[PDB]
């Protein structure tokens, strides 16, 4: 039997919230509060109902639980405001109201002397930063205001939280520079201020935050040089400052930090020669300097970084050949150098093959005009993701790729490749994304494609690769580019469009139960569209336009209920345009230039 005062507070609290948990169904007629889901006594001292689909509003009686030490209501659907009495519990040491739909703002008077952790992340809080919470809450170690609508200056105050360890102000709308007082925080080990609108140089006084382990400054409007302060940050492990306007090179002290694991300054304005003392940087495993104006040949000493696993140097202004020293990049797993004026793909491939841990390789927009190596000597045993697109490469499908049995994604589109698509292309048990579009392949489409294991049985299992860099996709040069953080984020895809191909569309394509995009536009295919394409239940996009196909559109295609993109324009088809199911959501354009009769669109004689 719990205290009648807490028993009442709990009842008002849950009266404004649905649905009642396990748990609380008998709350009206019980005194046994200490065993209800979430409660903990010794007087209620904890109340934890995170992730319980709670909907409604925070009752005012919450501030009546005078002995509460933990208040956890994270990950629910609680709207409206936080009651004022909750800002006066004398014993509350952890407050977690993250991931709800809380709104309004934070009071100017707060008195939480016991408070250690304050988390209002992922809500709709508005207004000025609760900086003054450091006045009465002298013991506070964690402040989390991330993902809210806090705007205005990044105001002074947090420097009064002498004991503060985590400060997260990410994804708000803050302006101004980092306030001078914040550099008093001798014990701060996390500072996230990313995804705001902060501006100005990044002060050298950061050297004071000597306890920092993780510093995220990314996605702001900072400018000037990266401050040369990294010898005064012996515990720093993660510097993230991408998408700012930083300039100059990598400072000597950053270039010599033995603790740094990850460095990400992508999308800035860095320049000159890129040097990193790989003898000093013994912990470095991920490096992302893409979209900068570094120049010269690719650094020759990067493989001396013996832990370096993720390397992204894309879209800089390097040039020339992959340095000969990259043979010894023993640790390299993901390597992306898109759009970097790289030369000699015969040499680059012949060298990168030595990196036995290499699983993802992106060389898009490089080697302009050269010839894909035919040499069958090349071996990439662990290769999972190979994107070598838009290089105008000549030659034929590289036979050597056939022994990369773990291949999951292959893009060789927008080249000048010839010959037939070999049949071994269908022996990749883990292949789920294939783009060979916009080349000059000839001959029949190989039947092995129809037997691609990862497209037929929805229980084939493999480990997705985990590069730190994202992948972008544009259908055409104009199209807004799409971001994909995860390899398994890509739709299962067979893209053979814009080639020079002939033969039928094999009936057996009906086997591919889990194919999403099937694109064969702009070839010279013939025969009838098999009724068995209805077997591809997961189809979202089916483009057969611009071929030589004959016969009617199989009326079974109506069963394709995910089908949102569909064209058979510019063929030789005849009969009635199928109606309903998905079909009346397709535009007139999908059926134009045929002998196809409609009912509302394309009449007949």
């Amino acid at each position: 039997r719990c205290h009648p005062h807490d028993l009442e507070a709990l009842r008002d609290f849950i009266a404004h919230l649905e649905p009642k948990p396990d748990g609380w169904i008998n709350s009206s007629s019980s005194t046994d509060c200490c065993n209800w889901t979430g409660i903990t006594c010794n007087r209620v001292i904890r109340l934890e109902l995170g992730n319980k689909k709670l909907s409604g509003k925070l009752s005012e009686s919450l501030g009546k639980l005078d002995e509460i030490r933990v208040l956890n209501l994270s990950r629910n659907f609680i709207k409206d405001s936080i009651p004022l009495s909750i800002f006066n519990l004398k014993n509350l040491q952890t407050l977690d109201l993250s991931s709800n739909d809380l709104s309004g703002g934070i009071p100017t008077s707060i008195n939480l002397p016991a408070l250690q952790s304050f988390d209002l992340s992922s809500n709709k809080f508005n207004g000025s930063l609760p900086s003054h919470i450091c006045h009465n809450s002298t013991q506070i170690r964690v402040v989390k205001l991330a993902v809210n609508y806090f705007a205005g200056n990044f105001t002074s105050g947090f420097g009064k939280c002498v004991l503060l360890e985590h400060l997260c102000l990410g994804m708000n709308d803050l302006t101004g520079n980092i306030p001078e007082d914040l550099f008093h925080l001798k014990r701060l080990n996390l500072l996230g201020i990313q995804e705001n609108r902060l501006s100005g140089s990044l002060s050298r006084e950061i050297r004071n935050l000597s306890s920092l382990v993780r510093l995220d400054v990314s996605w702001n409007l900072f400018s000037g040089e990266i401050p040369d302060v990294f010898d005064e940050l012996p515990q720093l492990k993660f510097f993230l400052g991408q998408t700012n306007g930083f300039i100059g090179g990598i400072p000597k002290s950053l270039a010599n930090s033995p603790s740094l694991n990850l460095l990400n300054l992508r999308n800035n304005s860095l320049s000159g020669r890129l040097m990193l003392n790989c003898t000093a940087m013994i912990a470095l495993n991920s490096l992302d300097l893409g979209t900068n104006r570094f120049n010269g040949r690719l650094p020759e000493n990067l493989p001396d970084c013996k832990r370096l696993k993720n390397v992204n140097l894309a879209r800089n202004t390097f040039h020339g050949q992959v340095p000969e020293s990259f043979k010894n990049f023993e640790s390299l797993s993901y390597f992306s150098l898109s759009n970097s004026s790289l030369a000699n793909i015969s040499s680059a491939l012949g060298i990168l093959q030595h990196c036995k841990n290499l699983t993802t390789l992106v060389l898009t927009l490089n080697f302009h005009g050269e010839a894909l190596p035919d040499d069958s000597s090349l071996h990439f045993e662990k290769l999972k993701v190979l994107v070598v697109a838009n290089c105008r490469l000549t030659g034929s499908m590289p036979r050597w790729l056939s022994s990369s049995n773990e291949l999951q994604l292959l893009d060789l589109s927008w080249n000048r490749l010839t010959g037939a698509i070999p049949s071994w292309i269908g022996d990749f048990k883990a292949l789920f994304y294939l783009d060979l579009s916009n080349n000059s392949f000839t001959g029949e489409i190989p039947k092995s494609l129809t037997k691609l294991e990862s497209l037929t049985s929805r229980n084939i299992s493999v480990n997705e690769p985990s590069p730190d860099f994202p992948f972008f996709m544009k259908r055409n040069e104009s199209a807004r580019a799409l971001q994909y953080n995860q390899i398994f984020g890509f739709p299962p895809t067979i893209e053979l469009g814009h080639n020079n191909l002939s033969g039928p569309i094999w009936e057996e394509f009906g086997n591919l139960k889990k194919l999403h995009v099937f694109d064969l536009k702009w070839n010279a295919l013939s025969g009838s569209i098999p009724s068995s394409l209805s077997g591809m239940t997961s189809l979202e996009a089916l483009d057969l336009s611009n071929n030589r196909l004959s016969g009617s559109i199989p009326v079974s295609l109506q069963q394709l209920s995910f089908l949102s993109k569909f064209s058979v324009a510019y063929n030789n088809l005849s009969g009635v345009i199928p109606s309903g199911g998905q079909f009346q959501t397709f535009p007139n354009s999908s059926f134009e230039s045929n002998h196809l009769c409609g009912e509302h669109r394309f009449p007949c004689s």
């Binding site: 979209t291 894309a314 879209r315 759009n339 697109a389 589109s413 992948f471 544009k474």
Partner: peptide, 5 residues
């Protein structure tokens, strides 16, 4: 085509 940046 897929690229990286």
């Amino acid at each position: 085509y897929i690229y990286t940046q």
